[PDB]
Design a protein around this ligand. Structure first.
Ligand code: HEC
Length: 104
């Protein structure tokens, strides 16, 4: 994925509710640092829905590709109220950005 395009997508579509950096604040949604390889619903200090806590899968490229296409379809009961990103290439770019930013 194209990390520079992904950053712009993150800013436009996600930053209102999320931070990615180490020690970043929680906002409407949880800080996303350390996301990859973690089970759903595990950011310290954030109050998740039971649905997000119980989904029970590991975040990675594939599971994010599916989640970000339609969040509430993947996690029914989620409080993340966001339509999703329809185009596969846009999801791949965003995910490439997340994979970098949430791990440095
Ligand atoms: C822009 C496309 C994004 C991306 C990449 C993510 N979000 Fe959100 N998000 C929001 C809230 C309230 C939650 C918690 C939901 C709940 O407890 O039910 C989330 C959760 C996520 C996750 C899961 C994190 C985990 O630790 O399991 C992920 C990967 C994620 N988001 C990515 C709120 C919002 C928004 C507020 C209106 C918006 C916009 C977004 N999220 C957008 C995005």
């Amino acid at each position: 994925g194209d990390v520079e395009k992904g950053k712009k997508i993150f800013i436009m579509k996600c930053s209102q509710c999320h931070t990615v950096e180490k020690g970043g604040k929680h906002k409407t949604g949880p800080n996303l640092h350390g996301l990859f390889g973690r089970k759903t619903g595990q950011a310290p200090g954030y109050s998740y829905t039971a649905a997000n806590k119980n989904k029970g899968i590991i975040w990675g490229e594939d599971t994010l590709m599916e989640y970000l296409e339609n969040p509430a379809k993947y996690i029914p009961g989620t409080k993340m109220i966001f339509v999703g990103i329809k185009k596969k290439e846009e999801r791949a770019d965003l995910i490439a950005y997340l994979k970098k930013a949430t791990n440095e």
